[PDB]
Amino acid sequence: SGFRKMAFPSGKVEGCMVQVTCGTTTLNGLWLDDVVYCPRAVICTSEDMLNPNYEDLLIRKSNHNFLVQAGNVQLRVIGHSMQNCVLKLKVDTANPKTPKYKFVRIQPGQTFSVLACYNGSPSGVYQCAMRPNFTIKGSFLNGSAGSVGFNIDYDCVSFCYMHHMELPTGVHAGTDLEGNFYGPFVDRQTAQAAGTDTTITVNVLAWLYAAVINGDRWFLNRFTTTLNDFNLVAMKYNYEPLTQDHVDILGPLSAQTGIAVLDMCASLKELLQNGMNGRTILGSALLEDEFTPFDVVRQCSGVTF
Amino acid sequence: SGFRKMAFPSGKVEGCMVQVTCGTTTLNGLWLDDVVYCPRAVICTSEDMLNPNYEDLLIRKSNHNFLVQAGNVQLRVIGHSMQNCVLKLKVDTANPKTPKYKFVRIQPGQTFSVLACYNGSPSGVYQCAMRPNFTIKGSFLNGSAGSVGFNIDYDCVSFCYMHHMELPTGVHAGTDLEGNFYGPFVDRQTAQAAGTDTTITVNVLAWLYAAVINGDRWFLNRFTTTLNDFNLVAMKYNYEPLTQDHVDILGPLSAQTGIAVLDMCASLKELLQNGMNGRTILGSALLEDEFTPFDVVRQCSGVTF
């Protein structure tokens, strides 16, 4: 019993984190096989980040200008290339600790674990979600760039995020491992506003199912609703519209609890319109939306890796 | 910027988790050097756990009755002993992945990371605290026994908790790595009630400092108070009494923020008496008490390991 924001075990990724230094700038990189992946902002000074021409800045860089250090293991760069907003540094040694891995571009609403690193060294691990505005609400200080977000399925690490920047709002933006930013953000220190932070409706419902499974039953009501009627309420409270695909994804949890999805939607509607009246759900006084339906099953079934 | 419930990187502990099977019962063990540590309930059936005489049950057990498996690495038990509520199984092979480690008995209010495991295999990592009633509010299913809680200081893993049981209340109880339970709990399936769940005052204050550092400033008021006046309020709301030792531990955060501890106490007093009026602090609608002063410094300074 009990329900917590649980991250994946980080060992498989810890063994891939390295330090990448170019001139005066140091950030983190990801060493998989004989390639190190890092943000291209490693080649920039602070003055450059105001308005950088990365292709011109990279001309003045050679293999020997990139210092890569795995703990004390000093890796030799034998090739370098820019892919979108990431640099790919070919090294002479394949990482012996390379896990089974994949690069995946995730969708808003999906969750992942972040291993926050500084100077190539891990500091902590936590679970985040890709917000509908394509930001993430993480914990990153200067030097965190190159930290990665990931999911694990038994032995395969699916890398989905590389951290790049912090917006003036205090939220965070980054890329997939192919270098493409999530959302409209660019790797430049300019005016970049996030967008409406909408609540991931399917995840709130999954978390409500997790609550029922763990004994929290006070929010269950006598009402039901329709998808269209609920979505009128969702719009008012800046909730993502619920689709039939979402209903389908919640089917397994509906089956285990015996609570129809549309009945849970009606309970959520009453919560949005009346509040929690000072009560709590799974130790929270607000509606949580960074648990996917898969996350709930995982934690309530005890899947291991 | 940003503040999250951050766990330590779990790699160093993942390499120590093994599966321990005795008869029909399987749980997790911790393989450090040539000893495997596990709950003594591994020798019990379900019927035994009603009222077990562990010393008598262990008489009918020999080295060959304990099957220890590290992934597929099958370890040979060459000796066994009971220490309080843990079994120490001497094996023929020292764990090559043994980290620098220590066994520590923590105090209520202190935090640690849990690596939840099943069948010797990791499932997830999360941060918990030893509650003042000597329970922990974790996420544990059947088979989780033997999962461990720990802290890391650069290269030294300090093991402080081994999971044993779940109380009918849904809270969790366990031992240190010497086998002594935290609190009055026993490894028997009997009537065991927890105790008053008091809020860790020094941790709430640390989290308020973390909020100010990260931009949350609305709760700062024009008042101050005294330790005795505040503690009158703390008692009413089942908060732990604040001591001068606690004030001293918060000194570094007071210095960085410029907010005197007693001024933050006055802001907390107003929050306890008036609520948050639907506002949030660091994304929470309740007062968080599972961040220590050390945890806040760690996350706001970027300490690595």
Coordinates of C-alpha atoms in Angstrom, one line a residue:
Chain A
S1 CA 0.0 0.0 0.0
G2 CA 0.9 3.7 -0.3
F3 CA 1.5 5.8 -3.4
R4 CA 4.6 7.9 -4.0
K5 CA 6.2 9.8 -6.9
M6 CA 8.6 7.1 -7.9
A7 CA 11.5 7.4 -10.3
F8 CA 13.2 4.6 -12.1
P9 CA 16.4 3.1 -10.7
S10 CA 19.1 5.3 -12.1
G11 CA 22.1 3.0 -12.2
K12 CA 22.0 2.3 -15.9
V13 CA 22.1 6.0 -16.7
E14 CA 24.7 7.0 -14.0
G15 CA 27.2 4.9 -15.9
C16 CA 26.6 7.0 -19.1
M17 CA 27.1 10.5 -17.6
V18 CA 30.3 12.3 -18.5
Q19 CA 31.7 15.8 -18.3
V20 CA 32.1 17.8 -21.5
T21 CA 34.3 20.9 -21.4
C22 CA 34.8 23.3 -24.4
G23 CA 37.0 26.3 -23.5
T24 CA 35.5 27.8 -20.3
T25 CA 32.1 26.1 -20.5
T26 CA 31.4 22.7 -18.8
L27 CA 28.2 20.7 -18.9
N28 CA 27.1 17.1 -18.9
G29 CA 27.1 14.6 -21.7
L30 CA 25.6 11.1 -22.4
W31 CA 28.1 8.4 -23.4
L32 CA 26.4 5.6 -25.3
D33 CA 28.7 3.2 -27.3
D34 CA 31.4 5.4 -28.8
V35 CA 29.4 8.7 -29.1
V36 CA 28.9 11.4 -26.5
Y37 CA 25.7 13.5 -26.8
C38 CA 25.6 17.0 -25.3
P39 CA 23.9 20.4 -25.8
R40 CA 25.5 22.4 -28.5
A41 CA 25.6 25.4 -26.1
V42 CA 28.8 23.8 -24.7
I43 CA 30.6 25.8 -27.5
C44 CA 29.1 29.2 -26.4
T45 CA 30.3 31.8 -23.9
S46 CA 27.7 33.7 -21.9
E47 CA 28.0 36.6 -24.4
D48 CA 27.4 34.1 -27.2
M49 CA 24.1 32.8 -25.8
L50 CA 22.5 36.2 -26.3
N51 CA 22.4 35.6 -30.1
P52 CA 24.5 32.6 -31.2
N53 CA 25.3 31.5 -34.7
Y54 CA 26.2 27.9 -33.7
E55 CA 27.4 26.9 -37.2
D56 CA 29.9 29.8 -37.2
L57 CA 31.0 29.2 -33.6
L58 CA 31.6 25.5 -34.4
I59 CA 33.9 26.3 -37.4
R60 CA 36.4 27.6 -34.8
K61 CA 36.2 24.2 -32.9
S62 CA 38.2 21.0 -33.6
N63 CA 38.1 17.6 -32.0
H64 CA 40.9 18.5 -29.5
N65 CA 38.8 21.5 -28.2
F66 CA 36.3 19.1 -26.6
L67 CA 37.5 17.6 -23.3
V68 CA 35.4 14.6 -22.3
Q69 CA 35.9 13.1 -18.8
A70 CA 34.2 10.0 -17.4
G71 CA 34.9 10.3 -13.7
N72 CA 38.7 10.3 -14.3
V73 CA 38.5 8.3 -17.6
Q74 CA 39.6 10.8 -20.1
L75 CA 38.1 10.1 -23.5
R76 CA 39.6 11.0 -26.8
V77 CA 37.3 12.8 -29.3
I78 CA 37.9 11.6 -32.8
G79 CA 35.0 13.2 -34.6
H80 CA 32.3 15.8 -34.0
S81 CA 29.0 16.8 -35.6
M82 CA 26.0 19.0 -34.9
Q83 CA 22.5 17.4 -35.1
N84 CA 19.8 20.1 -34.5
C85 CA 20.6 21.4 -31.0
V86 CA 22.9 18.6 -29.8
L87 CA 26.5 17.8 -30.5
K88 CA 27.6 14.2 -31.2
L89 CA 31.2 13.7 -30.2
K90 CA 32.7 10.4 -31.5
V91 CA 35.2 9.0 -29.0
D92 CA 37.8 6.3 -29.3
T93 CA 36.3 4.1 -26.6
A94 CA 32.9 2.5 -26.4
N95 CA 31.2 2.9 -23.0
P96 CA 31.5 -0.6 -21.4
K97 CA 28.5 0.3 -19.2
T98 CA 26.3 1.2 -22.2
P99 CA 22.8 -0.2 -21.5
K100 CA 20.2 -1.5 -24.0
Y101 CA 18.7 1.8 -25.1
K102 CA 16.5 3.7 -27.5
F103 CA 15.8 7.3 -28.3
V104 CA 12.1 8.3 -28.1
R105 CA 10.3 11.6 -28.6
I106 CA 7.5 11.6 -26.0
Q107 CA 4.1 13.3 -26.1
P108 CA 2.7 15.9 -23.7
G109 CA 1.3 14.1 -20.6
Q110 CA 4.0 11.4 -20.6
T111 CA 6.2 11.0 -17.5
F112 CA 9.9 10.3 -17.1
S113 CA 12.7 10.2 -14.6
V114 CA 15.4 12.9 -14.5
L115 CA 18.9 12.2 -13.3
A116 CA 20.2 15.7 -12.4
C117 CA 23.9 15.9 -12.9
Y118 CA 26.6 18.6 -12.5
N119 CA 30.2 18.3 -13.8
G120 CA 29.3 14.9 -15.1
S121 CA 28.4 13.7 -11.6
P122 CA 24.9 12.7 -10.4
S123 CA 23.2 14.7 -7.8
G124 CA 19.7 13.2 -7.6
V125 CA 16.8 11.5 -9.4
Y126 CA 13.1 12.6 -9.6
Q127 CA 10.0 12.1 -11.7
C128 CA 8.7 14.8 -14.1
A129 CA 6.1 15.1 -16.9
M130 CA 6.2 16.8 -20.3
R131 CA 3.6 19.6 -19.7
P132 CA 1.0 20.4 -22.4
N133 CA 3.0 23.6 -23.0
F134 CA 6.1 21.5 -23.7
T135 CA 7.9 22.7 -20.6
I136 CA 8.9 20.6 -17.6
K137 CA 8.8 21.6 -13.9
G138 CA 12.1 20.3 -12.7
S139 CA 15.0 21.2 -10.3
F140 CA 17.9 22.4 -12.4
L141 CA 20.8 24.8 -11.5
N142 CA 23.6 26.2 -13.7
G143 CA 25.6 23.3 -14.9
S144 CA 22.7 20.9 -15.2
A145 CA 22.5 21.2 -19.0
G146 CA 23.0 17.7 -20.5
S147 CA 21.2 15.9 -17.7
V148 CA 18.8 13.4 -19.3
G149 CA 15.3 12.1 -18.7
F150 CA 14.4 8.5 -19.3
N151 CA 12.0 5.6 -18.9
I152 CA 13.0 1.9 -18.3
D153 CA 11.2 -1.3 -19.6
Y154 CA 12.9 -4.3 -18.0
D155 CA 16.4 -3.9 -19.6
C156 CA 15.8 -1.1 -22.2
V157 CA 16.5 2.5 -21.2
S158 CA 14.4 4.9 -23.4
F159 CA 16.0 8.3 -23.4
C160 CA 13.4 11.0 -24.1
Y161 CA 14.8 14.3 -22.8
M162 CA 18.1 16.3 -22.5
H163 CA 18.0 19.4 -20.4
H164 CA 19.1 22.7 -22.0
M165 CA 17.7 25.8 -20.4
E166 CA 15.6 27.6 -17.8
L167 CA 12.9 30.1 -18.8
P168 CA 12.6 33.4 -16.9
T169 CA 9.4 31.8 -15.5
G170 CA 11.4 29.2 -13.6
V171 CA 10.2 26.4 -15.8
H172 CA 12.6 24.2 -17.9
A173 CA 13.0 23.4 -21.6
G174 CA 15.0 20.8 -23.5
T175 CA 15.3 18.5 -26.4
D176 CA 15.0 14.9 -27.4
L177 CA 18.2 13.0 -28.0
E178 CA 18.1 13.9 -31.7
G179 CA 18.4 17.6 -30.7
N180 CA 14.9 18.8 -31.5
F181 CA 13.4 21.0 -28.7
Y182 CA 10.1 20.1 -27.2
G183 CA 7.8 23.0 -28.0
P184 CA 8.8 26.3 -29.7
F185 CA 11.9 27.0 -27.6
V186 CA 15.3 27.9 -29.0
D187 CA 18.8 27.6 -27.4
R188 CA 19.2 31.4 -27.0
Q189 CA 18.9 33.7 -24.0
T190 CA 15.9 35.7 -25.4
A191 CA 12.3 36.5 -24.6
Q192 CA 10.6 33.1 -24.5
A193 CA 7.2 32.7 -22.8
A194 CA 5.8 29.2 -22.0
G195 CA 2.1 29.0 -22.7
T196 CA -1.0 28.0 -20.8
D197 CA -0.1 25.3 -18.2
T198 CA -3.1 23.0 -18.7
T199 CA -3.8 20.0 -16.4
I200 CA -3.3 16.5 -17.9
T201 CA -6.9 15.1 -17.4
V202 CA -6.2 11.5 -18.1
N203 CA -3.4 11.5 -15.5
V204 CA -5.6 13.1 -12.8
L205 CA -8.1 10.3 -13.4
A206 CA -5.4 7.6 -13.2
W207 CA -4.3 9.1 -9.8
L208 CA -7.9 9.0 -8.6
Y209 CA -8.0 5.3 -9.5
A210 CA -4.7 4.9 -7.5
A211 CA -6.4 6.6 -4.6
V212 CA -9.3 4.2 -4.6
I213 CA -7.0 1.3 -4.8
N214 CA -5.1 2.5 -1.7
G215 CA -8.2 3.3 0.4
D216 CA -9.0 7.0 -0.4
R217 CA -12.8 6.7 -1.2
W218 CA -14.4 10.0 0.0
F219 CA -14.4 11.7 -3.4
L220 CA -16.6 8.9 -5.0
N221 CA -20.0 10.3 -5.7
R222 CA -23.4 9.2 -7.0
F223 CA -23.2 10.9 -10.4
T224 CA -22.0 10.0 -13.9
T225 CA -21.5 12.2 -16.9
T226 CA -20.8 12.2 -20.6
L227 CA -17.5 13.0 -22.4
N228 CA -18.9 16.2 -23.9
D229 CA -20.5 17.3 -20.6
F230 CA -17.3 16.7 -18.7
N231 CA -15.1 18.5 -21.3
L232 CA -17.3 21.6 -20.8
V233 CA -16.1 21.6 -17.2
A234 CA -12.5 20.7 -18.2
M235 CA -12.3 23.7 -20.5
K236 CA -13.4 26.1 -17.7
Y237 CA -10.6 24.8 -15.4
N238 CA -7.9 24.6 -18.1
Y239 CA -8.0 20.8 -18.2
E240 CA -7.0 19.0 -21.3
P241 CA -10.0 17.6 -23.3
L242 CA -10.6 13.9 -22.6
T243 CA -10.8 11.6 -25.6
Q244 CA -12.1 8.1 -26.1
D245 CA -8.5 7.0 -26.5
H246 CA -8.0 8.3 -23.0
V247 CA -11.0 6.4 -21.8
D248 CA -9.6 3.3 -23.4
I249 CA -6.2 3.7 -21.7
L250 CA -8.0 3.9 -18.4
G251 CA -9.9 0.7 -19.1
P252 CA -7.6 -1.6 -17.1
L253 CA -7.9 0.6 -14.0
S254 CA -11.6 0.8 -14.4
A255 CA -11.7 -3.0 -14.6
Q256 CA -9.7 -3.5 -11.4
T257 CA -11.6 -0.9 -9.4
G258 CA -15.1 -1.6 -10.8
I259 CA -15.6 2.2 -11.3
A260 CA -16.6 3.2 -14.8
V261 CA -14.3 5.9 -16.3
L262 CA -17.3 8.3 -16.8
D263 CA -18.2 7.8 -13.1
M264 CA -14.7 8.8 -12.1
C265 CA -15.1 11.8 -14.5
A266 CA -18.2 12.8 -12.6
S267 CA -16.3 12.6 -9.3
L268 CA -13.6 14.8 -10.8
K269 CA -16.2 17.3 -12.0
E270 CA -17.5 17.7 -8.5
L271 CA -13.9 18.1 -7.2
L272 CA -13.2 20.8 -9.7
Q273 CA -16.5 22.7 -9.0
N274 CA -16.5 22.3 -5.2
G275 CA -12.9 21.8 -4.1
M276 CA -11.6 19.2 -1.6
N277 CA -13.0 21.1 1.4
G278 CA -9.7 20.8 3.2
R279 CA -9.5 17.1 2.8
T280 CA -6.6 15.3 1.1
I281 CA -6.2 12.6 -1.5
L282 CA -3.1 10.3 -1.3
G283 CA -1.5 12.9 1.0
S284 CA -2.1 15.8 -1.5
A285 CA -4.4 18.9 -1.1
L286 CA -4.5 19.4 -4.9
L287 CA -5.2 17.2 -7.9
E288 CA -2.1 15.5 -9.1
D289 CA -1.5 15.1 -12.9
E290 CA 2.1 13.7 -13.2
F291 CA 1.1 10.0 -12.9
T292 CA 0.2 8.2 -16.1
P293 CA -2.2 5.2 -16.2
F294 CA 0.9 3.1 -16.8
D295 CA 2.7 4.6 -13.8
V296 CA -0.3 3.7 -11.5
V297 CA -0.3 0.1 -12.8
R298 CA 3.5 -0.2 -12.4
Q299 CA 3.4 1.0 -8.8
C300 CA 0.3 -0.9 -7.8
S301 CA 1.5 -4.2 -9.4
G302 CA 5.2 -4.0 -8.5
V303 CA 6.8 -4.2 -11.9
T304 CA 10.6 -4.5 -11.7
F305 CA 13.5 -4.0 -14.1
Chain B
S1 CA 15.5 27.0 -10.0
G2 CA 12.7 24.6 -9.0
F3 CA 12.3 22.3 -6.0
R4 CA 11.4 18.6 -6.2
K5 CA 11.4 15.6 -3.8
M6 CA 14.8 14.3 -5.0
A7 CA 16.2 10.9 -4.2
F8 CA 19.9 10.0 -4.2
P9 CA 21.2 8.1 -7.3
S10 CA 20.5 4.5 -6.6
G11 CA 23.2 2.8 -8.7
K12 CA 25.5 2.0 -5.7
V13 CA 22.6 0.2 -3.9
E14 CA 21.2 -1.5 -7.0
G15 CA 24.4 -3.6 -7.2
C16 CA 23.9 -4.9 -3.7
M17 CA 20.3 -6.1 -3.9
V18 CA 19.8 -9.9 -4.0
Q19 CA 16.9 -12.4 -3.8
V20 CA 16.7 -14.5 -0.6
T21 CA 14.5 -17.6 -0.7
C22 CA 13.9 -19.9 2.3
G23 CA 11.4 -22.6 1.6
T24 CA 8.3 -21.0 0.1
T25 CA 9.1 -17.4 1.2
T26 CA 11.1 -14.9 -1.0
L27 CA 12.2 -11.4 -0.1
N28 CA 15.1 -9.1 -0.8
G29 CA 18.5 -9.0 0.8
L30 CA 21.5 -6.6 0.9
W31 CA 24.9 -8.1 -0.2
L32 CA 27.8 -6.1 1.3
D33 CA 31.2 -7.8 1.2
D34 CA 30.6 -11.5 1.9
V35 CA 27.4 -11.0 4.1
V36 CA 23.8 -10.8 2.9
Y37 CA 21.4 -9.0 5.3
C38 CA 17.7 -9.7 5.2
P39 CA 14.6 -9.7 7.4
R40 CA 14.4 -12.8 9.7
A41 CA 10.7 -13.2 8.5
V42 CA 12.2 -15.0 5.5
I43 CA 12.1 -18.2 7.6
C44 CA 8.4 -17.8 8.4
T45 CA 5.3 -19.1 6.7
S46 CA 2.1 -16.9 6.7
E47 CA 0.8 -19.0 9.5
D48 CA 4.1 -18.5 11.4
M49 CA 3.8 -14.7 11.3
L50 CA 0.8 -14.8 13.5
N51 CA 3.0 -15.6 16.5
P52 CA 6.5 -16.7 15.5
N53 CA 9.2 -18.1 17.8
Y54 CA 12.1 -17.1 15.5
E55 CA 14.8 -18.9 17.5
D56 CA 12.8 -22.2 17.4
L57 CA 12.0 -21.7 13.7
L58 CA 15.7 -21.1 12.9
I59 CA 16.8 -24.3 14.6
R60 CA 15.1 -26.2 11.7
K61 CA 17.2 -24.2 9.2
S62 CA 20.6 -24.9 7.8
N63 CA 22.9 -23.0 5.4
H64 CA 21.6 -24.9 2.4
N65 CA 18.0 -23.9 3.2
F66 CA 18.8 -20.3 2.2
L67 CA 18.9 -19.7 -1.5
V68 CA 20.6 -16.4 -2.4
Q69 CA 20.5 -15.2 -6.0
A70 CA 22.2 -12.0 -7.4
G71 CA 20.4 -11.6 -10.7
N72 CA 21.5 -15.1 -11.9
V73 CA 24.7 -15.1 -9.8
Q74 CA 23.8 -18.0 -7.3
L75 CA 25.7 -17.4 -4.0
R76 CA 26.7 -20.1 -1.6
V77 CA 25.7 -19.6 2.0
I78 CA 28.5 -20.8 4.3
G79 CA 27.1 -19.4 7.6
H80 CA 24.0 -17.8 9.2
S81 CA 23.2 -15.9 12.3
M82 CA 20.3 -13.9 13.7
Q83 CA 21.0 -10.3 14.9
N84 CA 17.8 -8.9 16.5
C85 CA 15.3 -8.9 13.6
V86 CA 17.7 -9.4 10.7
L87 CA 19.5 -12.5 9.4
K88 CA 23.2 -12.3 8.4
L89 CA 24.0 -14.9 5.7
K90 CA 27.7 -15.4 5.2
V91 CA 28.4 -16.2 1.5
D92 CA 31.4 -17.5 -0.3
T93 CA 31.8 -14.5 -2.6
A94 CA 32.4 -10.9 -1.7
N95 CA 30.2 -8.5 -3.7
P96 CA 32.5 -6.9 -6.3
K97 CA 30.1 -4.0 -6.4
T98 CA 30.2 -3.3 -2.7
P99 CA 30.3 0.5 -2.2
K100 CA 31.9 2.4 0.6
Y101 CA 29.2 2.1 3.3
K102 CA 28.2 2.6 6.9
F103 CA 25.2 1.5 9.0
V104 CA 23.5 4.4 10.8
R105 CA 20.5 4.5 13.1
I106 CA 18.6 7.8 12.1
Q107 CA 16.5 10.1 14.3
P108 CA 12.8 11.0 13.6
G109 CA 12.7 13.9 11.2
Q110 CA 15.6 12.6 9.1
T111 CA 15.1 11.8 5.4
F112 CA 16.4 9.0 3.2
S113 CA 16.0 7.4 -0.2
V114 CA 14.2 4.1 -0.6
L115 CA 15.0 1.6 -3.4
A116 CA 11.8 -0.5 -3.6
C117 CA 12.8 -4.0 -4.8
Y118 CA 10.8 -7.2 -5.5
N119 CA 12.5 -10.7 -6.0
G120 CA 15.8 -9.0 -5.7
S121 CA 15.1 -6.6 -8.6
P122 CA 14.7 -2.8 -8.3
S123 CA 11.3 -1.3 -9.1
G124 CA 11.8 2.4 -8.2
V125 CA 13.4 5.0 -6.0
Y126 CA 11.8 7.7 -3.8
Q127 CA 12.5 9.9 -0.8
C128 CA 10.9 9.3 2.6
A129 CA 11.2 10.5 6.2
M130 CA 11.3 8.8 9.6
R131 CA 8.1 10.1 11.1
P132 CA 8.0 11.2 14.7
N133 CA 5.9 8.1 15.5
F134 CA 8.7 5.9 13.9
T135 CA 6.7 4.9 10.9
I136 CA 7.4 5.8 7.3
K137 CA 4.9 6.6 4.6
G138 CA 6.2 4.6 1.7
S139 CA 5.0 2.6 -1.3
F140 CA 5.5 -1.1 -0.5
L141 CA 3.7 -4.2 -1.8
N142 CA 4.1 -7.9 -0.7
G143 CA 7.6 -8.9 -1.5
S144 CA 9.1 -5.5 -0.7
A145 CA 10.6 -6.7 2.6
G146 CA 14.4 -6.3 2.5
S147 CA 14.2 -3.1 0.5
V148 CA 16.6 -0.6 2.0
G149 CA 16.7 3.1 2.8
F150 CA 19.9 5.1 2.5
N151 CA 21.7 8.4 2.3
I152 CA 24.9 9.2 0.2
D153 CA 27.8 11.6 1.1
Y154 CA 30.1 11.7 -2.0
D155 CA 31.2 8.0 -2.1
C156 CA 29.9 6.6 1.2
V157 CA 26.4 5.0 1.3
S158 CA 24.9 5.2 4.8
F159 CA 22.2 2.5 5.1
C160 CA 19.6 3.5 7.7
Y161 CA 16.5 1.4 7.0
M162 CA 15.4 -2.1 6.0
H163 CA 11.7 -2.6 5.2
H164 CA 9.8 -5.3 7.2
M165 CA 6.1 -4.7 7.4
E166 CA 2.9 -2.8 6.7
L167 CA 0.6 -1.8 9.5
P168 CA -3.2 -2.1 9.1
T169 CA -3.1 1.7 8.9
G170 CA -1.3 1.5 5.6
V171 CA 1.9 3.0 7.1
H172 CA 5.3 1.1 7.1
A173 CA 7.7 -0.1 9.8
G174 CA 11.2 -1.5 9.6
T175 CA 14.6 -1.8 11.2
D176 CA 18.1 -0.4 11.0
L177 CA 20.7 -2.7 9.5
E178 CA 21.5 -4.1 13.0
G179 CA 18.0 -5.5 13.1
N180 CA 16.5 -3.1 15.7
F181 CA 13.0 -1.8 14.8
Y182 CA 12.4 1.9 14.6
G183 CA 9.7 2.5 17.2
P184 CA 7.8 -0.1 19.3
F185 CA 6.9 -2.4 16.4
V186 CA 7.6 -6.2 16.3
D187 CA 7.9 -8.5 13.3
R188 CA 4.6 -10.2 14.1
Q189 CA 1.1 -9.9 12.4
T190 CA -0.6 -8.6 15.5
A191 CA -2.5 -5.5 16.7
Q192 CA 0.1 -2.7 16.2
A193 CA -1.1 1.0 16.3
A194 CA 1.2 3.7 15.1
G195 CA 0.9 6.8 17.3
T196 CA 0.2 10.5 16.7
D197 CA 1.6 11.6 13.4
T198 CA 3.2 14.9 14.3
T199 CA 4.6 17.4 11.8
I200 CA 8.4 17.9 11.7
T201 CA 8.6 21.6 12.4
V202 CA 12.2 22.2 11.5
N203 CA 11.6 20.6 8.1
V204 CA 8.6 22.8 7.3
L205 CA 10.7 25.8 8.1
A206 CA 13.5 24.5 5.8
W207 CA 11.0 24.1 3.0
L208 CA 9.7 27.6 3.6
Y209 CA 13.3 28.8 3.2
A210 CA 13.5 26.8 0.0
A211 CA 10.4 28.5 -1.2
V212 CA 11.8 32.0 -0.7
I213 CA 15.0 31.0 -2.5
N214 CA 12.9 29.9 -5.5
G215 CA 10.6 32.9 -5.6
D216 CA 7.6 32.0 -3.4
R217 CA 7.3 35.1 -1.2
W218 CA 3.6 35.6 -0.4
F219 CA 3.7 33.9 3.0
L220 CA 6.3 36.3 4.4
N221 CA 4.6 38.6 6.9
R222 CA 5.4 41.6 9.1
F223 CA 5.5 39.6 12.4
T224 CA 8.1 37.9 14.6
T225 CA 7.6 35.6 17.6
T226 CA 9.5 33.8 20.4
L227 CA 10.3 30.1 20.6
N228 CA 7.9 29.6 23.5
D229 CA 5.1 31.6 21.9
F230 CA 5.5 29.6 18.6
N231 CA 5.6 26.3 20.4
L232 CA 2.2 27.1 22.0
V233 CA 0.9 27.2 18.4
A234 CA 2.9 24.1 17.4
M235 CA 1.3 22.1 20.1
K236 CA -2.3 23.0 19.0
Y237 CA -1.5 21.8 15.5
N238 CA 0.4 18.7 16.5
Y239 CA 3.7 20.2 15.4
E240 CA 7.0 19.0 17.0
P241 CA 8.3 21.5 19.5
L242 CA 11.1 23.7 18.1
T243 CA 14.4 23.8 20.0
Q244 CA 17.4 26.1 19.9
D245 CA 19.3 23.2 18.2
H246 CA 16.7 23.4 15.4
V247 CA 17.2 27.2 15.2
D248 CA 20.9 26.6 14.9
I249 CA 20.6 24.1 12.2
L250 CA 18.5 26.6 10.2
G251 CA 21.2 29.3 10.6
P252 CA 22.8 28.7 7.2
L253 CA 19.4 29.1 5.4
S254 CA 18.6 32.2 7.5
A255 CA 22.0 33.7 6.5
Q256 CA 21.4 33.1 2.8
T257 CA 17.8 34.4 2.8
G258 CA 18.3 37.3 5.3
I259 CA 15.1 36.1 7.1
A260 CA 15.6 35.4 10.8
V261 CA 14.4 32.0 12.0
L262 CA 12.0 33.5 14.4
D263 CA 10.5 35.6 11.6
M264 CA 9.9 32.5 9.5
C265 CA 8.4 30.9 12.6
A266 CA 5.9 33.8 12.7
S267 CA 5.0 33.3 9.1
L268 CA 4.5 29.6 9.8
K269 CA 2.3 30.6 12.7
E270 CA 0.0 32.7 10.5
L271 CA -0.1 29.8 7.9
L272 CA -1.2 27.4 10.6
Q273 CA -3.9 29.7 12.0
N274 CA -5.2 31.1 8.7
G275 CA -4.4 28.5 6.1
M276 CA -3.0 29.1 2.6
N277 CA -6.3 30.6 1.3
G278 CA -6.2 28.4 -1.8
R279 CA -2.7 29.5 -2.7
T280 CA 0.3 27.1 -3.2
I281 CA 3.9 27.0 -2.0
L282 CA 6.4 25.3 -4.3
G283 CA 3.5 23.6 -6.1
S284 CA 2.0 22.3 -2.8
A285 CA -1.3 23.2 -1.2
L286 CA -0.1 21.8 2.2
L287 CA 2.9 22.4 4.4
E288 CA 5.7 19.9 3.5
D289 CA 7.8 18.4 6.2
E290 CA 10.0 15.7 4.5
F291 CA 12.8 18.1 3.5
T292 CA 15.6 18.5 6.0
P293 CA 17.7 21.7 6.2
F294 CA 20.5 19.7 4.7
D295 CA 18.2 18.5 1.8
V296 CA 17.4 22.1 1.0
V297 CA 21.0 23.2 0.9
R298 CA 21.9 20.1 -1.2
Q299 CA 19.3 20.8 -3.8
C300 CA 19.8 24.6 -3.9
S301 CA 23.6 24.3 -4.1
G302 CA 23.9 21.3 -6.5
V303 CA 26.0 18.8 -4.3
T304 CA 27.0 15.8 -6.3
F305 CA 28.2 12.3 -5.4

